[PDB]
Design an enzyme around this catalytic site. Structure first.
Site, PDB file in Angstrom:
ATOM      1  N   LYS A  65      26.344  45.694  40.721  1.00 12.67           N
ATOM      2  CA  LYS A  65      25.154  46.534  40.268  1.00 12.67           C
ATOM      3  C   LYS A  65      25.945  47.293  39.120  1.00 12.67           C
ATOM      4  O   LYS A  65      25.108  47.691  38.083  1.00 12.67           O
ATOM      5  CB  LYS A  65      24.431  47.169  41.437  1.00 12.67           C
ATOM      6  CG  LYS A  65      23.525  46.356  42.211  1.00 12.67           C
ATOM      7  CD  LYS A  65      22.746  47.325  42.866  1.00 12.67           C
ATOM      8  CE  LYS A  65      21.809  46.481  44.150  1.00 12.67           C
ATOM      9  NZ  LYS A  65      21.093  47.450  44.934  1.00 12.67           N
ATOM     10  N   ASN A  86      19.833  47.153  39.136  1.00  8.50           N
ATOM     11  CA  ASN A  86      19.474  46.070  40.169  1.00  8.50           C
ATOM     12  C   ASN A  86      18.481  45.005  39.474  1.00  8.50           C
ATOM     13  O   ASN A  86      18.097  44.112  40.164  1.00  8.50           O
ATOM     14  CB  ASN A  86      19.214  46.300  41.367  1.00  8.50           C
ATOM     15  CG  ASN A  86      17.613  47.116  41.419  1.00  8.50           C
ATOM     16  OD1 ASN A  86      16.973  46.924  42.292  1.00  8.50           O
ATOM     17  ND2 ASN A  86      17.033  47.610  40.350  1.00  8.50           N
ATOM     18  N   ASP A 101      15.169  50.278  43.117  1.00  9.75           N
ATOM     19  CA  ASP A 101      15.526  50.349  44.525  1.00  9.75           C
ATOM     20  C   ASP A 101      14.936  51.861  44.849  1.00  9.75           C
ATOM     21  O   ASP A 101      14.098  51.730  45.956  1.00  9.75           O
ATOM     22  CB  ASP A 101      16.932  50.613  44.920  1.00  9.75           C
ATOM     23  CG  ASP A 101      17.665  49.158  45.098  1.00  9.75           C
ATOM     24  OD1 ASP A 101      16.774  48.363  45.489  1.00  9.75           O
ATOM     25  OD2 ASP A 101      18.938  48.920  44.706  1.00  9.75           O
ATOM     26  N   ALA A 127      25.297  59.146  50.597  1.00 11.29           N
ATOM     27  CA  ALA A 127      25.476  59.547  49.063  1.00 11.29           C
ATOM     28  C   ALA A 127      25.792  58.640  48.098  1.00 11.29           C
ATOM     29  O   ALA A 127      26.373  58.776  46.977  1.00 11.29           O
ATOM     30  CB  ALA A 127      26.232  60.999  48.922  1.00 11.29           C
ATOM     31  N   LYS A 155      31.449  64.367  46.663  1.00  8.36           N
ATOM     32  CA  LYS A 155      30.721  63.394  46.177  1.00  8.36           C
ATOM     33  C   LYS A 155      29.263  64.077  46.121  1.00  8.36           C
ATOM     34  O   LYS A 155      28.544  64.159  45.094  1.00  8.36           O
ATOM     35  CB  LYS A 155      30.679  62.206  47.023  1.00  8.36           C
ATOM     36  CG  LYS A 155      30.169  60.960  46.193  1.00  8.36           C
ATOM     37  CD  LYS A 155      29.967  59.629  47.127  1.00  8.36           C
ATOM     38  CE  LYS A 155      31.046  59.856  48.131  1.00  8.36           C
ATOM     39  NZ  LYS A 155      32.103  58.235  48.166  1.00  8.36           N
TER      40      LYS A 155
END
Length: 271
Positions: A65, A86, A101, A127, A155
């Site tokens: 992806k 995607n 998604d 995350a 993150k």
């Protein structure tokens, strides 16, 4: 006639051709939807080959992806935030990247499961790419708070700063002590290895919905924890999978297929 395909590695057990085939027959669309085992070395060349052979569009699965995102000429806002695509569409005359998604997940929750986020407390576990893809649509839905809980707080902090949205909050798992939520979404991969994310179990006490992103893997430890702690309705990722497919189908075909029958047939009862 018109050709589409999914590409990933491994791809042997993909449900995508099945789903889009069901859509095509229900919606009277003449198309063929195939599957390509993606190569770690020449993924990009495979995507270019399919286009070169008259292909109209593709879905992209793990692990490509990010690479799909980079290969694309134009990229939607969700794809940019996720750094992951995607779905691709080949239109006059380049390669356009989308990420559906998050939209699929939201629609499954709000429409299929009858839990609109608006004005409710929503906890997302993880995350990763799935969470990044879900953030824009989830925030657009106006929850009273959206909380990301993660082990890696650097993150999570990076994400919070990028969005700077008034309804978004981040948390360490331990810090969730004493907090309650209406909808909890497990977007970690824990369930794939039949494991359990580090939740204070009481966090699920007030929940109306516990949603497992994993598909068809039985009562995951997360959903089990939810049943133990309160009266949340339990769901896994089958609806997300079908709704994201449907978004791509509409992008390519200009038809929003019925997803009820498809979700039913792919559903693997949790209880």
């Amino acid at each position: 006639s018109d050709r589409y395909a999914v590409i990933g590695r491994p791809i042997n057990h993909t449900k995508s051709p099945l789903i889009h085939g069901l859509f095509a027959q229900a919606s009277n669309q003449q198309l063929e939807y195939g599957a390509i085992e993606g190569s770690l070395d020449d993924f990009e060349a495979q995507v270019l080959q399919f286009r070169s052979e008259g292909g109209k569009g593709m879905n992209i699965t793990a692990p490509f992806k990010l690479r799909a995102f980079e290969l694309a000429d134009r990229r939607s806002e969700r794809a940019q935030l996720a750094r992951a695509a995607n779905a691709l569409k080949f239109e006059d005359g380049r390669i356009v990247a989308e990420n559906f998604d998050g939209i699929g997940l939201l629609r499954d929750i709000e429409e299929n499961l009858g839990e609109p986020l608006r004005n409710r407390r929503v906890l997302l576990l993880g995350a990763g790419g799935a969470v990044r893809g879900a953030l824009l649509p989830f925030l657009q839905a106006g929850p009273s708070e959206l909380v990301i809980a993660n082990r890696d707080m650097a993150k999570a902090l990076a994400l919070r700063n990028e969005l700077d949205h008034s309804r978004l909050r981040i948390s360490r798992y331990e810090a969730l002590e004493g907090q309650s939520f209406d909808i909890v979404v497990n977007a970690t991969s824990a369930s794939l290895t039949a494991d359990l994310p580090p939740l204070p179990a009481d966090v699920l006490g007030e929940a109306a919905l516990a949603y497992e992103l994993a598909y068809g893997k039985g009562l995951t430890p997360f959903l089990r924890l939810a049943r133990e702690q309160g009266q949340a309705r339990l769901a896994d990722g089958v609806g997300m999978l079908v709704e994201q497919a449907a978004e791509a189908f509409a992008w390519w075909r200009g038809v929003r297929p019925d997803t009820r029958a498809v979700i039913n047939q792919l559903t693997i009862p949790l209880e």
